[PDB]
Design a binder for this molecule. Sequence first.
Ligand SMILES: CCCCCCCCCCCCCC(=O)O
Length: 135
Amino acid sequence: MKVEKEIKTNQDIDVVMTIFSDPAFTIPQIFPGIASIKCIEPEIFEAEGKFLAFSYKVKGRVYKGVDEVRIIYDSDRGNGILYIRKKDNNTLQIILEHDNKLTAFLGKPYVSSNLDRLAENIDEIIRLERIKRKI
Ligand SMILES: CCCCCCCCCCCCCC(=O)O
């Protein structure tokens, strides 16, 4: 069970991919109603969010590969994998697969709203990221 979004960017695609490898950027930008994020080390996070009446606590690990970021996560609302894949110099694909059908049904519109927002505002978002991070 998956929801996907293509993102077009004119920002340096490898800086973009690197920023998406930081869960402190990616988890709050995509998951529903994230209110807390803790980066234990660069590749490990915990976060808390809420959508509707449902609070949740999610934690996971980031794996970097060739042209790919894979975030493996587990939560009290089901477990999954978030992929960020570079498709070419100007394009990436985000794919979120989640193992809990009920949670997927309720969470999907929040996730989709976040992916649409990211797609529509990616280069302005990344420009301000790069100023703060100095990359
Ligand atoms: C991390 C625990 C709460 C996360 C909420 C995750 C929402 C995932 C939605 C995935 C949507 C695909 C399912 C579908 O096609 O209807």
